[model samples]
Target: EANEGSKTLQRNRKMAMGRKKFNMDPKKGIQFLVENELLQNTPEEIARFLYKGEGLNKTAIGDYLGEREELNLAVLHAFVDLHEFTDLNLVQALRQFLWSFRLPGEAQKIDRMMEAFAQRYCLCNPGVFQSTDTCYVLSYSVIMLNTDLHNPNVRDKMGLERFVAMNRGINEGGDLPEELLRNLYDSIRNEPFKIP
Candidate 1:
């Protein structure tokens, strides 16, 4: 299992996953349904899916997020630090590019967010939080991702209004978006972890 990936192999895997999650595939279809329903009452459906019963509420979800917001940050840093960070040809090219462009401050914020998750993210339902975290991160990440293009005062700077705009726009996708179906991934990838 070690050294299992090469450029071509990785490319094939990425393409396969991409196609599976794109267009009218099952992944995309589920995402669209979630969107049409709006991004509310998620914990219940999520709970039912995992627990086989209508379970929990929004307040519980909020508490979970707040706690985990600062829990796993340091652990995350250690993991990333321990890794050698190799170049895996074309497979890692775009990812490295995105990483390179990521504003340092936002990365720290994400760390904090993870830490918070550790402390607050639901003790149960790792699967649910994965989805929820993806949403939160995507909202935060989009603002940061487009900061360079949206505002010029600072290179890769996400303005408050810009983040709000990004959040509102993607969130309108409700529980899902018709295309990409990756609001959660997008949010996680781009959102800045910050506090007021």
Candidate 2:
């Protein structure tokens, strides 16, 4: 994994050479990028793309840079900077938001998202304590939904949402006990995002 010597570098060079003819010159690359210019699309398409995890089919930011006519003006372009690392409430809200990421697909990969956040950005990125909280919500949501939760009537009613809200690994207490946090701490620690 450490590049092992120049072998990996040579292999990469060979691969780049093989694709030389397909490489775009800097001007052409800029032109192509400009042509792409964060093109806007319909709300349905935006929702569809996000649901399918193919937003613009590229390595874009955690948020998109596009317009959605349905959302009045547009929200994807704006920054959620208020929810940065320092604000635990904002972090909690955003973590809860990003933590809500799930898809009824061939399989679940919410755990992978958690792992990427932990492995790739955990150390360099401050606020992992909160990011991990979000990951816990996602992982807990998946685990709860997957293992023993199946009730169409219950789901049809509101248990599905209740299930998610309850296990969000955050506080929503008005007159609750600190012991509840301690009691749930063990269970919450078992979540994928929770480091040892």
Give the winner by TM-score: 2
Instruction: List runs of model 2 lying over 4 Å from the truth.
Output: 1-34, 37-85, 89-91, 94-96, 99-108, 116-196
**lDDT score for candidate 2 against the true structure:** 0.36
Q: Tens digits of per-residue lDDT for model 1 on 1-196?
A: 5555686586555544433342224234224434544212343442232121112222222222222323323333332332232322211222332332122344644455444333232222233323545544553454445455444676565444554455444433354333333442344345432321
Assess the local accuracy of residue 138 in candidate 1 as a C-alpha lDDT between 0 and 100.
51
Q: How close is candidate 1 to the true structure, as a TM-score?
A: 0.21
Tens digits of per-residue lDDT, candidate 2, 1-196, equal: 6566687676555434322311323223223333444313443433333334322222232223222232412323122221233433322333443542332222323343444333323233554335555444544544444334343444543243355446444533332333433333434334322111
Tell me the TM-score of model 2: 0.26
Question: Which residue segments of model 1 deviate by more than 4 Å?
Answer: 1-106, 114-130, 153-175, 179-196
lDDT of each: 0.36, 0.36
How many clashes (backbone N, Cα, C below 3 Å) per candidate? 29, 0
